[model samples]
Target chain A: SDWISFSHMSSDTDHFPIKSWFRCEQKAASRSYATLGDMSHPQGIYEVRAAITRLISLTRGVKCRPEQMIIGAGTQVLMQLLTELLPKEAVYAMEEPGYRRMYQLLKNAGKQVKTIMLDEKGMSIAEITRQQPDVLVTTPSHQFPSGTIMPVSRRIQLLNWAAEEPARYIIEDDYDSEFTYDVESIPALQSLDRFQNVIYMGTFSKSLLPGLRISYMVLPPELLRAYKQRGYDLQTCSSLTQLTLQEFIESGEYQKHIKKMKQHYKEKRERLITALEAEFSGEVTVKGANAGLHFVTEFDTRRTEQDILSHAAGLQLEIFGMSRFNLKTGRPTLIIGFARLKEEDIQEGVQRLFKAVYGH
Target chain B: SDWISFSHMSSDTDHFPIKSWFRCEQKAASRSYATLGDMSHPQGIYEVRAAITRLISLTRGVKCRPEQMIIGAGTQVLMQLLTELLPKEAVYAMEEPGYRRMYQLLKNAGKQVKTIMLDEKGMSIAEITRQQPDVLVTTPSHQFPSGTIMPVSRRIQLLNWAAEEPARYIIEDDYDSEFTYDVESIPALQSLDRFQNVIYMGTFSKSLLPGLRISYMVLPPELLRAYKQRGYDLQTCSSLTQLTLQEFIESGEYQKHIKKMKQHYKEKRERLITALEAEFSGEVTVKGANAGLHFVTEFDTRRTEQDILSHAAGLQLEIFGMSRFNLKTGRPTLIIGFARLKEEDIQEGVQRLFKAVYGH
Candidate 1:
């Protein structure tokens, strides 16, 4: 609370309607279910899985049955589960400077990972083709640090690439698809995969509290069969929350909250962008501010990314550099998150950031 | 709801003090914490870990620091995390006819797994030595399916076995350590392991609701260092539940509940044993009822395990055969769980089981 944290990726829960959440949780506590739990179906509870099916179909345009959904706690944990489902020899490809947690997770799981360099349109198709990876993990909605939005052209190509081989698949990390400031939300890459070649991941981390740790994936029939055959109890999140979330969705509170938060985040994003343009003027250029919680700010200054970071730390400002996400990017490219900041804090952070980068 | 189920292992949550649990959960909601949570400390929040440190030290006699605790959603998930922390070349040893879920988890994770057959005292030490696994996973408290409470003599031998080699380690699955009935609870193997060779594991799945999916492990310093070096986040349980569980433990409600449930289960277990003895009258033998939720029922009959199961199904009874858990024991060995039944249901189950075994 003391610092102007541009690196904080979690949505400000001060905006969360606690009264509504408490009501849902109370219902969850009051709701009668079997005490032993339906552990027989370890995939998840039917109500929650059914709700997820409807949620993704309406929101992300990804259609799947409740049986196709697998719920877990976090993105990294889900990735580990996915890796377990895939062939041991299946080589994985990820966008360079992508979600570092996932890269580390895949590596730790003994997966052969290839990091494909990104172009302006997101993960480079040429590099991906060269990598010959069986699985491609792409954040098509808004690329992690770069915030590159892959166009429909690349999305179709990625699907075709997946369909080229029997074992090939695309893992659509549609993590923050709910937040699009200016542009209309992009349809998920999984929406285009007519064949079962995509594993679409969605999370409540950005929309709800990251502390909730509720994330789900829509698997293809083939993989779902494999998961069932393996008979693993992958349900990790609290069943209370899962049930509460189901009620929250069925009551239309989740969609209502998303709309309110989208407007709330849009205000913060616009304010930060305006403040940056007015304060920095000729000193910096901000890109990818139109979608997602974070945007890439490339400074025009000759200072190294490390220099800007050190100066920011001198003040109580925390900003992340693109290079910090396991990349060797040129110049001073910082990933700035505005979802967790106040309007006043945003202005103060921009001013502090300007002072840090250009000594204004 | 009507099935006389003897295969269920989950404790009757009907006995759970939902009002008390709700009170703790409400406090968890009201308590002030960061919305983003302390993601920096991926191990878990300190309050919960601190609570666990006290819990294990007081209850199980396994002393460890809050920093040494790693909380996850389930034992399986925690085991997966442990495998990642362990050397890739490390061979794992588990008890034969063990917790089959765990064996499957370890095997599917690409770890080399060896199943050591159990003697009367638990996993045969000589067989374990013959297998020569780097890590030994033993359920010393109450061996699964067999109900063999490993003796103190064997516990010392197992600890010494761990200390013999550089990579030798023991994973003590003290899963149901809280429910010892007729005898004073055995001290955890980790308590005897002065050389930091034992990894102590515990869970609330039996003591509380299985739906909560909260399990924890206390890593020895050597493994903790490796975990820190890898810097992988293994926090999968809901932080809200984690915080609430902390408050529950702190308020002493958890211990109070455990004591209450233990008494409740003791009544059911005793009744089931009584019913079996009075009805069968030397036709059946029940053992391991003094500890844990389940026990082994060896039937002195010429019928096949399949025949018993089929007859039980006809009478709307669900029972598990030891052979179903991947064993070819000489006689009909049924694993019976009493924790999920009504007192009336237990009586009905026993009567139905007798009728199924011998037509009258």
Candidate 2:
């Protein structure tokens, strides 16, 4: 048996998708005079614009264009491309205990990846100034694991900082920024300053459930050209999926789907929070609960994260160790995703997690 | 007014076939996992087997395992990867008038790509012995623009050459092997040997039409691990297209498609020959008429290759003037592809050519 029963997660391929992509392909074949590999189609500008528009609209931003956008496979590949295109030895500031892969990727690219301390508000501006990094890579809109949104003053400060140093590029990853319903989602950093030093990255994986693997970057033209020659090939990401997604957005299906997920996952989120309170209240402390896909809870220092995780595994539970993302910070915590599980499942899951913690 | 008329080639997105592909994609989407940028699915092993098996069955060849097959976006990318994995300063014997990009690509990789002269017989075996190149790249099935399939004797000689010197590699590019109709397509060079010396490459761009840019190679295990590391990071061909093609073969649709095109193009080939005989009789000499999608005609000395080409273009024709692939012992020539034109079109086209040449 598979260690994780992904049968529930398997994407439905029941219909004739490959056949139809080709049929659409055959129809396009009739009009295709120039081969894709043979020439550059400037009309791609329009296609890029259309894709970017749909992506932003699906998230929260309303206005976007081809000029402000470039497409790449997933966040990982795009990160490598972006790092190459930027100035050499780019001093990049990122969250200390953030997404571990992003941290690993930045470090792997030979960039000076500095960690900014995150507090209840968000990344400290004072530290950012002290570092004086050439580029800033941040999950500012929603702090990773902590789930705290940067306050309005800090958002302004970050924007003002970009204005002061016109060359610095700020990468805002609005990964699940659309999911925060406790309050209105914050306006995008790019949306604030039209010509600002901002390169935002967003993906569909979390919102629609994982494994869609499509992401977009809101990039300026100069950087986009450099990124192209850096050897990213045209074959990644499904052309049909991108097309279907465009239709899904244009036909109003994507918005409807996201709206449905938001309401559904919201209830699951509340149930998990309530369950955590009812049991093991003193043993664990929760953060980042008002928004996004998952919440992180720091256990008391005496508890070993492995023991808690192993116990959860014994009961057949899916859990993430938050310490995986912790580089400089030594805190041990559990990061639990409640969206995929139902409200009843969330209640049972938290009870199981509580039992695991207490028994250990 | 679109800037270009119907007579000129261009692409329009509204015509790009958004609908039917959606149907195939919708089914694929449901049953599929995302083609993520990470690790290769050993799952791809099955699909690669299915595709290569269908290809081998269509064109006679050695028995293959899915393990021998590697999939890539196109032949060029594979060539780059192959060069990188080869020994330093490896000698490459390439055809003189062959594809220039391959020469530049191999040279840039520090591999010494030496040229072999082409005559009526095809890539010279004498040159192979003289240079004792570490690798030889040839399109034996239909020898590039010259279009001569290697007879059984030379095939044996080439195989023996590799057997004598096991350190050398033979790259058989059977690109247009599927299009020949005069005789059965010869077994692939890779099929002729069980050794690790042969690397075979083929692409759908030439055989199945261009937009579906899929290519594959059969490699020995030593090169396989390195190519996998270089290639697996690149997304596999759209799983839907790859899987759709697999089903297309199993359902007999692919062979049926090939059979229909062969018949259609064979007639076009005959019409082109008939027109050339009736019109350009005393003015040009024709070669490679029995097979392949295009044919070559050498213009008489009095007409100057440029004059003949300009006159043909003045009458609205697209013909290639050749001094290109001929570095030594060849007259000025014109290469034309008649396989894509209709019978009536060929008749009218040749009459115009006659007027441009003899003005009769």
Candidate 3:
């Protein structure tokens, strides 16, 4: 009843398809073969790649051959791989108040990076035009932390930004688009690319278990040869691990699981929204509630952001300030994570939050 | 029966401990909780790290706290992690005729890498001393491709080279040390380091399955602070994968499994040695036969390396040339891999190899 950590970003693994997953893993493990140990190809298992090709094409409308995709253990590992696949001197474009983990990763790896400011319609493409080449990493479907969805008009504009240059790339990190509570789902930006410049990345971290560490990236046609030429047999994830994941996707259980999770998240989000309204009663407004696991809530309190956080800490409630991911600062809203939060604890947690902030 | 691949270097999963592994994985997956999705710590699961602590201390005699170790999906991933942990301007020392995959990884990542040539005792420390407080990557217990177990005298020489400077590091990649056929196993170089300059790395790929990408690195005490300072929650491998492996090690099945495999590899190595002698007799000399999955065989033939390789290919046999991993040329030897080769096929494969080179 005391500690409600609204900051944990991992997906809820309570609804894990244990029976189906166990069946697939057991089947994959029992088969005695060379394919289990062969690390000759950096590109993941052919069968697994084929399954990924089929799944993403149908679900996200992001079409690509199995050959173009690379299945690594994590996106971080794939980013290291992508750094090798591209020229070293190339500049990188990231959202100003973006995913700092990736931004730090790029900067630490000695990449030339430019942070572009974001409007209500996602990241500004006009600032990205200055850098020659530049791979822009954007959460277009649902901008992370901020949770602003890029409209189709701006999506076309961003695709045109890539069309002007051959070396230019847009790394569409479609991390949490599966959990959008909206009625009409927006198609992935990878589906809208005119030129073969969009490098689409997806993860099972948000949908499945984050501990599983299965992330994949689809490379463009031009970069495939460079990857092929520098083929050193460095298999990142385990083949047994990959085979199990492949079966999960191929059996269409993944599609069903996502569908269930989307509805589950929607119900939880609605519950949390109602509880917040009941507690604050027209004083607080919830933004970023339309998409993803986390939503931004602004309270009508005179207390400073730090003061609010300090009070919440003393009351044993963990919360996230919006400025944690913000580049320019001045984000007074609190980020409430509903995925890991218990359904029963929602109302009480809201009450605790209200008392901590406005009571004094 | 015709196509024998002696070039393939993968652990034979025919005798894998599938039952024990399945038991561990099942137990791990059944625990439906947040620990499964918590990617907060990059140090891996505490239980897993503790088990690694106990196993490596006894086996390799490399003593360190569980906190000093990192569990990544692959050695390649660990190398990338190490790159970020250390200062970027650091020069890396790699063994010539070493693992080209790792060498290319360091070079491609824009590190200043120097190649040190190997002698009978292992890599030359004299050349390594020239690099100012650098990191040297060596396979001491059993040098890859060449299979030279560095004597303790030379190990000290390399250790002293590290101790002279505060920042110098010796990356002891003790790969395939468990599979040695010698009466007494060579103690790992990490055990002998007086100063905290040695970064020891070990992989289960040789003993278990190569497809199971579970590799670990033991960091020095001084470097732990730097790793902590850059505490971005980037979990490299799956917690389930680590837990299963931990259970395998902790239950003492890993020890029993290694004991069984050592005998298995010894018998197979002797059988292949006898087969080679029976076919070539005085013509072929098998070197590097004391350890590892593959061994070097110097052929008494006048044919060029390409000519020999061409004939083997025409006969539908796959082979590896020693010059492939060699920095300098003139390594007129063949690498014979017996791990995946069926026991019955060894005699026939050698006979075919004799005919391919001598007849054509």
Candidate 4:
């Protein structure tokens, strides 16, 4: 078995801001008011919403009203809620090789989903226009697998397309945008959209911890009214968890943790890059290395993904095949995650990956 | 403003097993192995399922298999998941005065929902036969506001209706079954079903704490397959919370807390009943006093629900109108929740209600 699980997106637990989180949780537990309060507040706890609004405004450069936001247990729940709001039989489009689980979730909700092909600049506007989908789900900040950051021009074009029709809306998933290493952060698509066609979603899964299960959506005013009109009651997440998160953000520990993680992940990224370049020289190519926890490495060899995967397994190195993320067939690219591994382990793992695939 | 909020079903947090829960959470926060694990496990964490299975088996007398369970963030999420599994244009039926929010949720999802009239025994099977809805959602343990425990014969009749066709199924919402005071606990409808037509649902919001936000469903073998086949790939609740709950159950603290809460609620029920009897006697009737955190109090006077509610509010005694829970207009009745309030507060609140309503 590969001691390092490169397929996972979890951060190392040893460095988690557990002390601060526990302190906040302790405070929440002691308060004990609203323990049995009504679950009908779809927008979520007032204190939590205030904290989320302040945080999103400062970090994502979006003036988010607490009333315009709805907190969910996870992104899946948020997507499910969105599916309920979209017009009946609405065509859904998302980036090809995108988050497959999300695609499946929307389809499960009976929405017609189409996969739009991706190019270097990110989701191709031409393909999106061809589909003419009412809702477009995209990870513009750091796209999954390929990690293509859509440029400002493409973002504007997409917003204009959404603005063209009242039914058209864009779901901008700003997942894992906090971990960009070598590049300046892009403003969230929601912040740039003047027509209010963008539904911005963010999660603490990557930056904080997935087990916390805290995710939120900044809805357009129209969508918010529709949601309220539908009477979609039930605050799905734990109220206590929401309160602790609010305190964590209010106390500045949330930003502190994010800064520390960015620094730590940056060091790991550097080590992996240095090792890959040294071992494979110019024969190997790297993509999406500027941001996020994982990146793709394309080998020059003509071996099939299965062949490389089996060989790597024999050498006790685990790597994900990129084809799993693709809607159409692609090259034999290996996806490596360096967030959970230690500094020394990153270099060794990369070298081992080289020897495993190349038999050097 | 009415000082009393008798409309909520939250647990009495003063006696919650916080020490054990906090310790378990501390253990979970320290273990980072499953932090970024895939979110699409429909059955939830294996350990959590095992723990739930064992606890349900011992308490609910149901031989629950881990494979038969699907964990959800809350009952609403579970209902949303069930909506996906039902047939196209599926008609859903629930108790006329059942959980109104649930009725709204399904209706919002575009399902044709019909309200089955409630009789003294529970949901009238004769009307169910007339509507013949594909799915029937019922609180069989203690009928919500009516507090009618579905007798064994009624339970069998409902089960037979479900077995009449392969397409029909019953959704058993066993909410607040733990706090039954005057009567023996009725077996869960799932426990009595021989044809696997019952879909059993349970939540920790009432027994434990709503802030924990943990709920689960026991699916029949066929529906379980359908859910898996549909590829529902998101665990809506937190992994850390699930793990902590598992530890809480496995360590026997969950059962211990439930047992303690049952006694605490029983005392509150007695106090409320005694106070009501002393104040109103034969003039006012108390319904569903043998179970649940709340009960219905029907005034014999010809006052409208609005007039009674306003008078109660003037005296700072907040209570819910029975018409809100009913499909058609009904008699003026007040839904009073006594679980969150103290014994003395219940006595004082009832006296104040008498003074405000009768000016005595």
lDDT of each: 0.81, 0.62, 0.79, 0.79
User: Of models 2 and 3, which has the larger TM-score?
Assistant: 3
Give the per-residue lDDT digits (tens) of candidate 3, residues B227-278. 8887554767778878888778877889989889888888988888888888
lDDT of 2 by residue, A250-343 (tens): 5555566667767766765776677788777656688887777677787665558888777778877767787667855355677766544544
TM of each candidate vs. truth: 0.96, 0.71, 0.94, 0.95
lDDT per residue for candidate 1 within B291-315, as digits (tens), equals 8889888887878888888999989
RMSD of 2: 6.5
Model 1: residue A138 alpha-carbon error in angstroms:
0.7
> For model 3 chain A, where is the 10-residue window of minimal lDDT?
A323-332
lDDT of 3 by residue, A1-360 (tens): 457766647557567776787787877666634576567357888788888888888878997999998987888778878877787788888887878888777777778888888787888877776554478889876787778888888888899988886677888998777767765677788898867888899987877778778889999888888888875647676788788887788777888888887878888888888888888887887776677788788877777788888888887788878777764324367878877777777887888889877974
Give the winner by TM-score: 1 or 3.
Answer: 1
Relative to the true structure, candidate 3 has a C-alpha RMSD (angstroms) of 2.4
Instruction: Return the lDDT, model 4, position A142.
Output: 81
Give candidate 4 regions above 4 Å deviation.
Answer: A32-40, A314-316, A328-330, B27-40, B328-330
Question: Which residue window of length 10 is worst by lDDT in model 4 chain A?
Answer: A32-41
What's the residue-level lDDT of A158 in candidate 3? Answer: 90
Please state every model's RMSD to the true fold in angstroms.
Answer: 2.0, 6.5, 2.4, 2.2
Docking class of 3: medium
Write out fnat for all predictions, comma-separated: 0.52, 0.05, 0.74, 0.53
Q: Would candidate 1 be rated incorrect, acceptable, medium or high by CAPRI criteria?
A: medium
